[PDB]
Amino acid sequence: QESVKEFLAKAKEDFLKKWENPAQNTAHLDQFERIKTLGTGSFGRVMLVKHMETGNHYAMKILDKQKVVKLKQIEHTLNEKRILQAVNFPFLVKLEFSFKDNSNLYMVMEYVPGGEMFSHLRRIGRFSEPHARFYAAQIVLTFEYLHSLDLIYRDLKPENLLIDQQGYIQVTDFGFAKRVKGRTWTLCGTPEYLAPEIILSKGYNKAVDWWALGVLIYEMAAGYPPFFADQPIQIYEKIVSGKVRFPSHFSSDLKDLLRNLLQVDLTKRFGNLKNGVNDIKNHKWFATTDWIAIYQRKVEAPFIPKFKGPGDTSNFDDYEEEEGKEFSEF
């Protein structure tokens, strides 16, 4: 306490001013490159570029204006831009400049050369328990900060997590993030981590992302999704059933922690009853963790991806390349 509460209050006060005065059109599409396409994604494209004036490499996002209107996805990107321009924490991708063109919108974000954690999990298959705990601690910390900012992430799947040179997780893809004070209602996200509250088409509370964390922990510690099915409709029925079949090599402490993070009962769901995160942070499974050192990045990472220079794209996949009133604050 004490220091943590003061830090949270200072962060909220600073974020209020940033949300009050967002910028727009900070750069033009004339000082970047087209070395490679890092990845397309949901409905866009992202390419790796380098600063022409400076030399530092920066990731650039691209979104089609017609697609946003056609998919009825206009407010989400507008709010995501403000969230990115206002968020400030060690575990989030930092945005440098934004661009607005008559054809597509662009924005500059810091590049993480470690690649997607989904590929690492798939190649390795499954992690050891301390390795999973090392990531769960960072995820819990960033969720603490984000909840202290009165926002909801609502989209937490492994391919949206990146690794940096030091080996820590950087969280990206804030497109579905919404600053909601109270009960939400919008249905979206990924079927695998769709919480039982959202599946029933009811007002989602702040505990919707807790189920996402409880599913990501199982996916990282097992190697297969804890809830899987052939079809999304069948997957919806399986999630509604709420019966989980744990593997044999799972420890007792993790078996206890996972049960609370995935309980159907909203009242008894962990991290929502009385403490918020203080119950989870004090759990036995997290007993061997230096949170003060985790915040200061003073603990050596148990995994370092092979970095081969700023221009290296070895970890990232290689697949080809590339060649009005709705938006007014971009």
Partner: protein, 1134 residues
């Protein structure tokens, strides 16, 4: 699926859903498929997950892991919900006599009688539906605990796995298999009894005001007397246990060695020894039974004292109205029921349950095996300075290796002296303190002693994986399994039984190889796979799978063959716990060429049971005579008095039927004594009969199927049966006497009692069929659980190395559900029967009460007084009858055993010899004829290795054989088998020595002089051997004579044969079991002392039997003959 889910509330209250099973089973035999589907709440998985979640919450919450604190938050509320209704159903019974005490007032009485009926009607519905729920809760806890213990049985490390005994787990599991389920109906009486006695004492104070503690103190001291006698019983039982052990070991010894005794004709000797052993057993059993009879009769006797003492002080000071006697008698019997039997039962149940729960809690905290951080990715498996102890003694001397992806190393050295330990360390089963062994994590092992799980060969080779046509075909073809499949029964899906006995050792090796090759893994640690196959088969396997297919991926085989190491990409030879030589193929081969060369229930059963002893009929008619005399005397005195204070006091004698009809101490003892004598006589006769059965009939009986009739049936016949039948006869006698007394006092009761008896008999007969069928089905449905547990405990290493635990967990859950269906259905039908019997008693009580009230002061009081309290004794009698009917099966089986029929000059002649193992099997001999020379050895040659034990056994007529034998001019028919078998002497491969002193072990009949025996022993060359024994000859050959060597045992057998002065000596396997010094000494002794005996040496080697003069050739179904070696070696062997 289960009919419980689809049932009316009335049916669920009246157990109406159990009708169809009774309807079907009474008329036709049940099929196991007819058992109803388990309720979805009672599935093993559903309870296991719940209890496991509570238990791991307890583990992760506090540092005081109390398992009962996890059972509480699971079952406490339903437990209390049922306990409340149990309390109310007891309170109504306790408070009922207050209505009777007001009924005796005589109009208004009809309403009071209706109210009296209402209480019984309510109690009928308030007790049983809660008892059934308590039993259901017990079943749930038992299922969940069993599932948890099995789920933890696949997590222990080998460090603590080998330390525990095999029998510990099975003893703990079977200890509470039925105790826990029925140990809940008496659980609530730990707090219902004290409140009951408090209410009753207060109410009796509201009627006496001066004398309450007087009876309660007497009840208390009686209770401590009864409890204290238990220790006296337990001491005698503990003393008897060791004697039963030492008798049973000898009985098993002779059961195993039946044929040796038959050849030696030692039946009467062991008859005498067994009787001598059993005499003291009978003494102790009789003392324990007398103590038990005293303890049982104390409760029956105290029923009069407990009310006499309560009434006496108030009676002397003030006169007492008859109301305050007929009310205090009922309150007093209720108190006696509540404080003498229920409360100690509840205390015992609580103590045992707490002990079992604490044992389970202790078990669930053992050392746990930890899986390696594996399955991720790895280069060449590398071990660097691995050092660990196989138990201080380092089994690994800082070994180091690195096998590239595809290379096939080959460890060599002593078996299990470092190769197996290194393989286990690589597999991660043993944690290495020093070093870091890194592996890909996908490891498929293949132990030297392969284990075959029960099921089909396809099931034992698929291991819960798909049947890839190309992969399975290649595995079958390469591992020599294609020919075995072509020779298999179903040829693709031959369903083998448990244990793999139907398969050969090479078949087991092929199965292990197929299992190892099935799994796709980055390391296939096939340890000693080729140790059970032929040399050509080994070469074919190497050229097919090991060095053809399994060499594509990384593989670390362990073979001692010189040719196998030739193809190895690396060699690591280890010996004496250290790596003697290591390196590449050529480098290690040329490192030291010199070292390289050096290295390489019917009525008939009843009447038969009573008619075994004439004293039993005498004592039973005696007891019946005293019974009818005493009931007649009581009836006549009741009539005289009903048609000075002591005159009214005498009613207390007749009021409590227990004391008035109690079996006197002068009558119960002869019954128990006669039953013990009957059991002794039956055991002796059955032992006599089993020792004379024909061998062919005995062959049909499995070896384990006879020892059980000695170890379990006799104990049941001695301990459980006598007390059960005594209690049943006493309870039935009490019931019939009381009902006759009621009927005589009012002659219109008889017309109501007759249909009651008819319906009693009809209902009991109806329920018995289904009860017994379900009992047998449940009993036969319990073996697979233990079989699977033992199989998993044996296969643990391969099971965990492969990584297929959930398959086994689901199999165990399926078996548990299979047994639970039968158990739950039987419990439900038992509760149904109990409730129906309560209802019929209730309607009988309605009839008697109304007919009594509608039509003096003593009449109605006595009638109602017996009427209200007969019920407990009646229910006890019915339950005892069902228990004795259950117990009659042991008597039936023993009687099935008793009626088994019995079997029926030096020159000798044989002709028309026809023999077979059974009656009508393959002819071992087909009219084989031979002539025995006088004193000339005839070697057993010809068909050596085809099996000559049959001919040797038939020579003594110890098998199903027929023909003509003429030895010394006497036919085999006229000479008695007891007399004929003594002349012939045999030397069996296994020598049987009786567990006892040398004089007894060598002279069971003890018909020879000690000096003569010593002289014979000196002449047999065993004097020096016996000189090292303790004492002179009294050293008991305990443990079946394990002290003596095999050669010493053979010499002792030869000396015993010489003592019998047998005319022939059919020595078999002389040098097979004898050491070279022992064989030479035996041959010299046979040449010197046994020169005059017509011996016939049997040996596979022709050279060994070449010393014999004659050479009796042998062949399939025809005994050839070549008396001279000049033609035997040229025609018989060539």
């Amino acid at each position: 699926r289960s009919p419980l889910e689809k049932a009316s509330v009335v049916s669920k209250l009246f157990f109406s859903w159990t009708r169809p099973i009774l309807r079907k089973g009474y008329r036709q035999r049940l099929e196991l498929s007819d058992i109803y589907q388990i309720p979805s709440v009672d599935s093993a998985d559903n309870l296991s997950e719940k209890l496991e979640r509570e238990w791991d919450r307890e583990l992760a919450s506090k540092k005081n892991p109390k398992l009962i604190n996890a059972l509480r938050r699971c079952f406490f509320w339903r437990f209390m919900f049922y306990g409340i209704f149990l309390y109310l159903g007891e309170v109504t019974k306790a408070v009922q006599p207050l209505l009777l005490g007001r009924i005796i007032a005589s109009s208004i009485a009809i309403y009071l009688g209706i109210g009296l009926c209402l209480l019984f009607i309510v109690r009928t519905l308030l007790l049983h539906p809660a008892i059934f729920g308590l039993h259901h809760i017990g079943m749930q806890m038992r299922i969940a605990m069993f599932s948890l213990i099995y789920k933890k049985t696949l997590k222990l490390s080998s460090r603590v796995l080998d330390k525990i005994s095999i029998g510990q787990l099975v003893s703990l599991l079977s200890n509470n298999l039925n105790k826990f389920d029925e140990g809940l109906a008496l659980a609530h009486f730990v707090w219902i009894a004290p409140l009951q006695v408090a209410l009753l004492m207060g109410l009796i104070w509201e009627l006496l005001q001066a004398s309450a503690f007087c009876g309660l103190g007497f009840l208390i001291v009686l209770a401590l007397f009864q409890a204290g006698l238990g220790r006296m019983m337990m001491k005698y039982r503990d003393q008897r246990a060791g004697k039963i052990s030492e008798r049973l070991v000898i009985t098993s010894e002779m059961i195993e060695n039946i044929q040796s005794v038959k050849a030696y004709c030692w039946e009467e000797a062991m008859e005498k020894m067994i009787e001598n052993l059993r005499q003291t057993e009978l003494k102790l059993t009789r003392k324990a039974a007398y103590v038990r009879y005293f303890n049982s009769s104390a409760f029956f006797f105290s029923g009069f004292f407990v009310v006499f003492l309560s009434v006496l002080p108030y009676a002397l000071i003030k006169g007492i109205i008859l109301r305050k006697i007929f009310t205090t008698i009922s309150f007093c019997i209720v108190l006696r029921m509540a404080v003498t039997r229920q409360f100690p039962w509840a205390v015992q149940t609580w103590y045992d349950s707490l002990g079992a729960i604490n044992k389970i809690q202790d078990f669930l905290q053992k050392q746990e095996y930890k899986t390696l951080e594996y399955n991720l990715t790895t280069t060449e498996v590398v071990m660097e300075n691995v050092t660990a102890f196989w138990e201080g003694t380092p089994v690994l001397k800082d070994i180091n290796f690195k096998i590239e992806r595809g290379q096939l190393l080959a460890v060599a050295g002593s078996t299990g002296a470092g190769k197996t330990s290194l393989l286990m360390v690589i597999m991660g089963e043993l944690e290495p303190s020093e070093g870091k062994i890194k592996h890909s994590g996908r490891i498929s092992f293949c132990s030297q002693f392969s284990w075959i799980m029960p099921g089909t060969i396809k099931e034992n080779i698929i291991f819960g994986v798909s049947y890839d046509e190309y992969r399975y075909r290649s595995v079958i073809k390469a591992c020599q399994l294609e020919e075995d499949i072509s020779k298999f029964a179903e040829k693709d899906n031959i369903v083998l039984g448990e244990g793999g006995i139907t398969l050969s050792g090479g078949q087991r090796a092929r199965i292990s190889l197929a299992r190892a090759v099935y799994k796709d893994a980055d390391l296939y640690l096939l340890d000693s796979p080729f140790g059970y196959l032929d040399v050509l088969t080994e070469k074919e396997i190497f050229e097919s799978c090991v060095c053809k297919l399994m060499a594509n991926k990384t593989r670390i085989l362990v073979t001692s063959k010189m040719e196998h190491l030739k193809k190895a990409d690396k060699i690591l030879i280890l010996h004496e716990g250290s790596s003697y030589f290591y390196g590449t193929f050529s480098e290690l081969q040329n490192l030291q060429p010199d070292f390289s060369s050096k290295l390489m229930t019917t009525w008939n059963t009843y009447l038969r049971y009573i008619t075994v002893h004439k004293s039993l009929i005498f004592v039973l008619i005696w007891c019946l005579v005293i019974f009818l005399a005493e009931v007649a005397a009581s009836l006549v005195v009741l009539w005289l008095l009903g048609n000075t204070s002591s005159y009214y006091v005498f009613y207390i004698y007749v009021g409590v039927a227990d004391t008035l009809l109690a079996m006197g101490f002068f009558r119960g003892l002869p019954l128990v004594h006669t039953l013990i004598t009957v059991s002794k006589i039956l055991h002796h006769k059955m032992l006599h009969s089993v020792l004379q059965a024909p061998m062919s009939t005995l062959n049909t009986l499995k070896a384990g199927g006879i020892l059980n009739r000695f170890s379990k049936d006799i104990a049941i016949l001695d301990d459980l049966l006598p007390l059960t039948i005594f209690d049943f006869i006493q309870l039935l006698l009490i019931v019939i006497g009381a009902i006759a007394v009621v009927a005589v006092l009012q002659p219109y009761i008889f017309v109501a009692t007759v249909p009651v008896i008819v319906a009693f008999i009809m209902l009991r007969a109806y329920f018995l069929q289904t009860s017994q069928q379900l009992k047998q089905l449940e009993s036969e449905g319990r073996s697979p659980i233990f079989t699977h547990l033992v199989t998993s405990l044996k296969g643990l290493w391969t099971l965990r190395a492969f990584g297929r635990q959930p398959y086994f967990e689901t199999l165990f859950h399926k078996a548990l559900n299979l047994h639970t269906a039968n158990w739950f259905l039987y419990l439900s039908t038992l509760r149904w029967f109990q409730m129906r019997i309560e209802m019929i008693f209730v309607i009988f009580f309605i009839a008697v009460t109304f007919i009594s009230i509608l039509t003096g002061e003593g009449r109605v009081g006595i009638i109602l007084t017996l009427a209200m309290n007969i019920m407990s004794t009646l229910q006890w009698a019915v339950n005892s009858s069902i228990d004795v009917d259950s117990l009659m099966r042991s008597v039936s089986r023993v009687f099935k055993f008793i009626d088994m029929p019995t079997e029926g000059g030096g020159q000798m002649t044989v002709k028309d010899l026809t023999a077979k193992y059974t009656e009508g099997g393959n002819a071992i001999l087909e009219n084989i004829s031979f002539s025995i020379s006088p004193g000339q050895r005839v070697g057993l040659l010809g068909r050596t290795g085809s099996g000559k034990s049959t001919l040797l056994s038939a020579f003594l007529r110890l098998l199903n054989t027929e023909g003509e034998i003429q030895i010394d001019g006497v036919s085999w028919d006229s000479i008695t088998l007891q007399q004929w078998r003594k002349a012939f002497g045999v030397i069996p491969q296994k020598v049987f020595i009786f567990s006892g002193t040398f004089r007894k072990n060598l002279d069971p009949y003890e018909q020879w002089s000690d000096q003569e025996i010593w002289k014979v022993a000196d002449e047999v060359g065993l004097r020096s051997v016996i000189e090292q024994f303790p004492g002179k000859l009294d050293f008991v050959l305990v443990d079946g004579g394990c002290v003596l060597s095999h050669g010493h045992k053979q010499l002792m057998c030869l000396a015993r044969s010489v003592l019998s002065k047998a005319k022939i000596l059919l020595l078999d396997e002389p040098s097979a079991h004898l050491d070279p010094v022992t064989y030479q000494i035996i041959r010299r002794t046979l040449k010197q002392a046994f020169a005059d005996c017509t011996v016939i040496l049997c040996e596979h080697r022709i050279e060994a039997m070449l010393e014999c003069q004659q050479f009796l050739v042998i062949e399939e179904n025809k005994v050839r003959q070549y008396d001279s070696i000049q033609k035997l070696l040229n025609e018989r062997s060539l």
